[PDB]
Specification:
The complex is a heterodimer. By secondary structure, chain A is mainly beta. Helix content of chain A is 13%, strand content 50%. Chain A has one domain: OB fold (Dihydrolipoamide Acetyltransferase, E2P). In chain A, strands 1-2-3 form a three-stranded antiparallel sheet, covered by helices on one side. In chain A, a hairpin with a 2-residue loop joins strand 1 and strand 2. Chain B is rod-shaped and about 15 Å long. The chains are: A mainly beta, B mainly beta. Chains A and B meet through strand 1, strand 4 and helix 1 of A and strand 1 of B. Strand 4 of chain A pairs antiparallel with strand 1 of chain B, so a sheet runs across the interface. Chain A: It is found in: Nucleus; Nucleus, Nucleoplasm; Chromosome; Chromosome, Telomere. Chain A: Keywords: Chromatin regulator, Chromosome, Nucleus, Phosphoprotein, Repeat, Repressor, Telomere, Transcription, Transcription regulation. Chain A: GO terms for molecular function: chromatin binding; histone binding; Hsp70 protein binding; methylated histone binding; mRNA binding; protein-containing complex binding; protein-macromolecule adaptor activity; rDNA binding.
Chain lengths: 52, 6
């Protein structure tokens, strides 16, 4: 439902993987943690998982 | 790309 600009960080909460992302067009204050199942951006994810 | 916002 909302365009994702980039993945800032990652964590495991409740056995669930979550991504801290920033939405394009919105302020950093709007950044939110979203479980991986909420994302539709394999490019950013695959790219983030490689930057480690 | 995109993502659901909770």
């Amino acid at each position: 439902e909302y365009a994702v600009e980039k993945i800032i960080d990652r964590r495991v909460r409740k056995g669930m993987v979550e991504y801290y992302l920033k939405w394009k067009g919105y302020p950093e204050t709007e950044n939110t943690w979203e479980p991986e199942n909420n994302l539709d951006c394999q490019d950013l994810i695959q790219q983030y998982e490689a930057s480690r | 790309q995109t993502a659901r916002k909770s």
